[PDB]
Amino acid sequence: MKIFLDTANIDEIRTGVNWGIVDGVTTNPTLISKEAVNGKKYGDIIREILKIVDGPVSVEVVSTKYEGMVEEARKIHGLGDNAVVKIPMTEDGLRAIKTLSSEHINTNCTLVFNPIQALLAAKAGVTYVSPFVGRLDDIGEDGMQIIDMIRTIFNNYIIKTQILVASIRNPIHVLRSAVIGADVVTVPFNVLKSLMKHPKTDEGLAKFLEDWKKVSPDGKLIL
Amino acid sequence: MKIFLDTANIDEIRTGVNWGIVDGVTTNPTLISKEAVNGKKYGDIIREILKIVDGPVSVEVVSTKYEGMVEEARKIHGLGDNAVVKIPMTEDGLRAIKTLSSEHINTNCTLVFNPIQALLAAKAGVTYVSPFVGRLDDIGEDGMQIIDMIRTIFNNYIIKTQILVASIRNPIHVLRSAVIGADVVTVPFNVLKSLMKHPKTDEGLAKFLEDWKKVSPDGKLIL
Amino acid sequence: MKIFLDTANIDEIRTGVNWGIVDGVTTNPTLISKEAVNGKKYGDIIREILKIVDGPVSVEVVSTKYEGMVEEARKIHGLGDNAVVKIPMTEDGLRAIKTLSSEHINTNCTLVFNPIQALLAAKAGVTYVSPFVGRLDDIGEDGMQIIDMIRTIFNNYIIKTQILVASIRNPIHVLRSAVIGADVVTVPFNVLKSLMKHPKTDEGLAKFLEDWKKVSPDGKLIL
Amino acid sequence: MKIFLDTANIDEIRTGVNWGIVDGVTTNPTLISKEAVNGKKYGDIIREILKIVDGPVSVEVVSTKYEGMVEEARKIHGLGDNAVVKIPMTEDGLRAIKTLSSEHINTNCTLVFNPIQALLAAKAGVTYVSPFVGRLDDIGEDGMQIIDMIRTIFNNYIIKTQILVASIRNPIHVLRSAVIGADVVTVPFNVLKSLMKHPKTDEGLAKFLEDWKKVSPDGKLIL
Amino acid sequence: MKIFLDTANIDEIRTGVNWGIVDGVTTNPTLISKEAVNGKKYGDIIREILKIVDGPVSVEVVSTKYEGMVEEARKIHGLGDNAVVKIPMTEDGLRAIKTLSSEHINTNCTLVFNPIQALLAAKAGVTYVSPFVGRLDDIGEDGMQIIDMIRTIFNNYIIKTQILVASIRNPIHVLRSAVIGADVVTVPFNVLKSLMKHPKTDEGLAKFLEDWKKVSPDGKLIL
Amino acid sequence: MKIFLDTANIDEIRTGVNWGIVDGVTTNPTLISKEAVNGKKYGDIIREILKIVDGPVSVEVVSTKYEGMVEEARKIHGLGDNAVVKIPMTEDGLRAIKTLSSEHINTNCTLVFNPIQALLAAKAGVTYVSPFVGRLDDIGEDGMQIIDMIRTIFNNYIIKTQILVASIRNPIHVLRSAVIGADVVTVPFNVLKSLMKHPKTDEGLAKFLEDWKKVSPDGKLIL
Amino acid sequence: MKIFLDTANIDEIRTGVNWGIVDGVTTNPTLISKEAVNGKKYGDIIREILKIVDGPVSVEVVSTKYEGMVEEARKIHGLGDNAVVKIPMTEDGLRAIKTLSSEHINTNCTLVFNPIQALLAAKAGVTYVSPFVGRLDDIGEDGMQIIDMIRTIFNNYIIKTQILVASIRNPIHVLRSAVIGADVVTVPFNVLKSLMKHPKTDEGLAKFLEDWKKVSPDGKLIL
Amino acid sequence: MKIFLDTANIDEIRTGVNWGIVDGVTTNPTLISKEAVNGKKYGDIIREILKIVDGPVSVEVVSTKYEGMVEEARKIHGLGDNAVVKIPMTEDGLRAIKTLSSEHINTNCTLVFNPIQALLAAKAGVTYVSPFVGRLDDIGEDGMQIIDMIRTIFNNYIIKTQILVASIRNPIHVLRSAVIGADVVTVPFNVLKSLMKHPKTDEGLAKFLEDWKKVSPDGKLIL
Ligand SMILES: *[C@@H](CO)[C@@H](O)[C@H](O)[C@H](O)[C@H](O)COP(=O)(O)O
Ligand SMILES: *[C@@H](CO)[C@@H](O)[C@H](O)[C@H](O)[C@H](O)COP(=O)(O)O
């Protein structure tokens, strides 16, 4: 399972990349507009992320119409080979995906909330589909159930579109995505940070340290 | 999973095709006779649909006897290479399918209401079999259970006949079909139009628009 | 399981009532506005339904504010002992339900789309809660799963609020509701009339009639 | 589980009753017409069955309209206290059941093919409901599944209507009915006979006889 | 669960009774005729067993006809109040059980090999029914499945006939019977003797003995 | 799944073969003796069946000893390449199968009633094994369970012997065989006929005809 | 599934072999010592079995120490290419297995009572592992559950050691072994002879014989 | 499944290695510090284990920082080609594993307590991952459940990292690990010695010994 960071915060991205556990990044218009403040321009932020991240970086078109989406998608693609164009699940978006796929431009279909929307995005040729699990949780439906159905559907038809689980809110969305077999999860920085941690890891390290001091006062291993 | 449009309404078909989410069309004598009124000839409607739709178009014979079925099937076939001949599940129909298969004319067995009828159609060599789910729901039996059994049976015997789920009434028929792994669903236009939609997609788009205006008052993405 | 008719059409109601299979009626502002045309007044329609139907008749408030909802509710109550006041799942709506419940005015919480909304309506003291199954089906979620969870939750806490399944679209919503154990379904007229029918019933009657004529020419049963 | 005999053959009835394994009888117009041959009159057949059988005896009305059904039902009821009036699952039928129930006349609703038909009959106050399992098997649906759902539904609502499984064709219909918990099965004579039998019973008897001869040449137990 | 000994061997019975784990005895013509050799009379064996065993003792009739069965049953009954009359699952046997039940003579229906035979025996009023599990195992059917179905059926109808599992061949028949909830098992002596035993019991006792010698060389507990 | 006809009635065979739905025929000595009446000779009946039927035709030996079975088998095989020799599950039978398999003569082991009998037949090299499901139903055991276990066993060991389900009594035996994945079912003619039929097929045909009349009074499809 | 005979009785072996259903033989020191009486020598018994049986013949070492076990093993090996050396699950036994496996001497690890013992024997390279099911049943644990776990473990790791189920007591140990997919069962003679038998086989043959005599007086099948 | 010894005690290791059932060894700072007392040096202990164990020997770094971990790892590697470097699940540990993997130095990530930690370790390229089951049991969660999830996740993504189950406390941890399909278990010496043993193995050997003495007074097997 690939793990992407879901943020436009450059400090977060630099930190996660330096950890070597980040395989790519997703952004969206809300995340970008959050960071583009106090003199920061959205063009600069987008370019900076593309440069810092080796892996896929998803950037969302803002046009709602086919022609505008395709024009923006081409500009996004032009910014770097790792750029992936994020396109919403709408009639115009499916049309844009089909055109862009034929032009060999990688795509990510977003704002997906049920398995049939996901199947339609796959049929348009999309590179990644992003169902939102937290926003479903918000409205009282267990969002992970949709991921499970999408995985079964895609398995049934040998679909090559990757499942990129989005709107992740906690480490159990991550755990359940891996057990289901989603291709990618994209996670906010707080969640990413949590993933490596467990109290028994800390406790075990402390005990090893203490026991080793018994035989090596300076705590060294000399071989 | 292929998605066909189940109508003879030329306006619906043009619209669906332009959406890019329609892989073929199914008709039947009721659908066609509904459209062929106030001057419109059934022969013209059939030809127009064949012209408009790139993918398979199912057209049903009206003869109840073997010889008449085959004679009608050949005429249907001659109207275009994308024509598929719809034949009912009857003794004469099974005979006609067998003959037509040997002539390399694609066939679609219809009015199937249990898994054994579907198996018989596959044994006759039919290209598609169309179990009806809504008409079973109508009489108090969950039609989707028949689809589930047909998929299992076809899997068991590595049967190449495609399952083309028909009498679809709602988007859950479509969802359950995809999870089962049916090859094709054919849907009325009202159902088709609902498949792309979800209130959280609309809501997320509105929020993205609003947030983006904060960094680009005119609402565009200049890269 | 009680069976209510979901309509404001007097002809449908008179017909279903005379069939003996209708235990009550649910209306809403859309259904009533459909009928209040060609000079028919909504006030007359409502009173007429109350008169024809011996069982519960739900009638929806139109105000969105607490004070207006309880004013309208008391007026609805004043129309007949069988009136039930339909109130939407909103903050004001729950406050209204709590007040009316204490006043011993029967209530029906509507526009419920998940089990926790249903629980909140029950906690406010509502007489009936109406989850909408068809409108969930519309958006690609199997609405019956919400009925199943609500039944489990209500069982857990011995909740006395009745589950009144609404937005019913077909006879399998009705079947599944009965197997789950919902207290009430409310169904459109087209669904109601289908519930008694089965082709093997018709076939079986025809055969019995024919056999009997073999021993009683006139077809009589003289005892 | 009560076991009824499904026949109008007087000889079978006498034999079954004398085996002591028969709790009642069901007839229908086909079964009776079969016996009312060569001078035998249907009215005499019906009266003799009521006489020979201590348990319930189902006799079906032939009229298809409400007034005729109620008139014939009252006549059937007048023939003896053990008479039960068989009424078909129709609009008129349900009305007749309601009326007759209020007159304390026992009823059996017949020609039921799904669980919602059975529920409607129960709601009309019917004494017994008779779903047909063999005729469902005939059309490629496992009829025992309908009995299972009806049992669950009736359990949910504490329904007092008895499930009387009909159209029984083999001993596994009987076994499955008992495991589900149906109130009554009605069986043809040939099925009835087979229920007492097993090759290991016969084999064990033969062996006990042979072994006992060794200790008692005359094969008696003298105590 | 009661545990009966399935033998006519008086030595086995005395031994089992002295162990305190035998609640009753079952015999049959094969078991008795096995013991009644070289002078020993079957009448004496039966009387001795009735004297030795406090609990129920099943003794089988040898007549195959109703009148002979009942005459033998009454003689068996007169030998002692703890006698239970074993009657085979046949038409004549069901008749005899019914008569004997009305006379307050306890009965045990034997040679039962499926759940419907067991139900018929319960319907005749039998005190115990004895399905055979080993003889089913002999012919390639898992006999315990029949016990499981009988328990479910008897539970469904609140049947008071006790399930007395017979033809027991090993301790897992006994374990599975207890987990299912059979009322009684009847076991051959070899199986009986194994039930108390386990290698870890012996091993734990040996260790306890050894450890105790360390604080009390003579091996006693002085308190 | 292949469908064979289980009959020696020449008229049924001709009819079934001409429906095009029959892949072979099974006979046995009872079926043949039924036809060999009024001058008709068994040898002529067998030869005619081999002639009319292109697929396998099972003909049963009557000898009970190894030498007689092998002699009769060779004669049956000599009558035509499509002849398959039916051999009973006995000690001599298994030996005959082994010999005949080494002689490249196709075999069908019959009178199988449990899964281990079926495995032994497969180990002897038999071409088809025929468990009897109806005769198990007769004695109160669901015969389809044996087919399920045999399928699992044969899958485990990659056994090439084909499962040919026999003693079929109804269309649910057929449905369950297909869902399990049995290689072949052999069915009586009356069952065969019922497999193509469904009341909703007939009803849908009638409706298509009526609707088409509106657009074509003569009910033809002129293209 | 292979079927071996678990005995040292030459008469039983000759008989089972001549039946054609015995694929090999297992012995042990108890079985051999039973037979080596009245002047019969164990050395002659073993060589005689090796001669009669074409398949694997397991013969158990009596030494408890590594050196003795490999010495005896090599001598057993020297008796015939079909000899298999049975070695118990002990520390010395595993060492012996590892040595012999490298010497290409076939081995059978015996006295296995749980799945981890079976895994250790496999890891030592053993040809066959023999878990004991009956001796577990003796102590109140269902021994077949251990076979199921061993099959799962061996599947997980693609282990080539064959599972050779031993301490078989009845035909359901054999049935369950086949459904689980054990490679081999070894069975006592009394169990072997029961595997071919079923009362409905005998009953069916008798009926076929009678019917045939109706058309062939002599009972011949002349073709 | 590979079985390693989890200890730094040379006597235990020498013993297990002599038994032939130990495939490798794991150590940790606590285990080593335990043995390195009363003059024993940790350097000698580590080298000694490397010398006598043919298979993988895991040795843990003590540094908590990336540079120290990588340096200590290279030193461990240099001690022998069977050394595996144990590295804790921390940020600097994952970085170290990635570097060491690129240097073709085998690694074992330790102190793993949930499946997502295990996944991150795999993503870093670790050779083995070691989730701790006993320490989870300690804090009241069944640690084997984490092993099951890790197996499923690794299967989903065809991950080549081996699951090395650690903190093993009893033989049921070993059994469950094998049933799940873990690649390796590492076990304390007390657990290891218990794996070969079972009381029925001992009892069976004693009986075989006793019986053989009947045929061979000196207890030998002469062939
Ligand atoms: C792109 C893939 O769709 C990604 O940035 C998504 O847009 C975000 O994961 C969601 O919008 C986050 O929503 P949430 O409601 O904050 O969890
Ligand atoms: C052809 C079969 O592939 C297709 O047009 C079917 O005839 C229709 O789907 C059904 O007739 C539609 O029936 P419904 O009762 O309207 O749902």
Ligand SMILES: *[C@@H](CO)[C@@H](O)[C@H](O)[C@H](O)[C@H](O)COP(=O)(O)O
């Ligand atoms: C009242 C709730 O008991 C009832 O009238 C509901 O308002 C209706 O059942 C729904 O509004 C019907 O919606 P649909 O989308 O037409 O199925």
Ligand SMILES: *[C@@H](CO)[C@@H](O)[C@H](O)[C@H](O)[C@H](O)COP(=O)(O)O
């Ligand atoms: C009455 C219902 O209690 C009963 O006589 C039923 O009418 C019969 O069981 C069925 O008509 C029998 O039909 P089948 O198709 O012969 O099985």
Ligand SMILES: *[C@@H](CO)[C@@H](O)[C@H](O)[C@H](O)[C@H](O)COP(=O)(O)O
């Ligand atoms: C009486 C029934 O309660 C009892 O003695 C039974 O007759 C026996 O348990 C069986 O006959 C024993 O048969 P098996 O074939 O020896 O196991």
Ligand SMILES: *[C@@H](CO)[C@@H](O)[C@H](O)[C@H](O)[C@H](O)COP(=O)(O)O
């Ligand atoms: C042969 C097996 O392939 C086949 O003819 C069988 O003999 C028959 O199916 C059975 O004998 C039919 O028995 P039933 O009891 O009539 O169902």
Ligand SMILES: *[C@@H](CO)[C@@H](O)[C@H](O)[C@H](O)[C@H](O)COP(=O)(O)O
């Ligand atoms: C060898 C293992 O393949 C085999 O002879 C076994 O030793 C026997 O199957 C058992 O010893 C038989 O024990 P039981 O307790 O008589 O069933």
Ligand SMILES: *[C@@H](CO)[C@@H](O)[C@H](O)[C@H](O)[C@H](O)COP(=O)(O)O
């Ligand atoms: C190393 C593999 O990670 C191995 O030595 C582990 O460190 C041990 O298995 C555990 O530390 C043992 O802990 P426990 O709490 O004693 O069971």
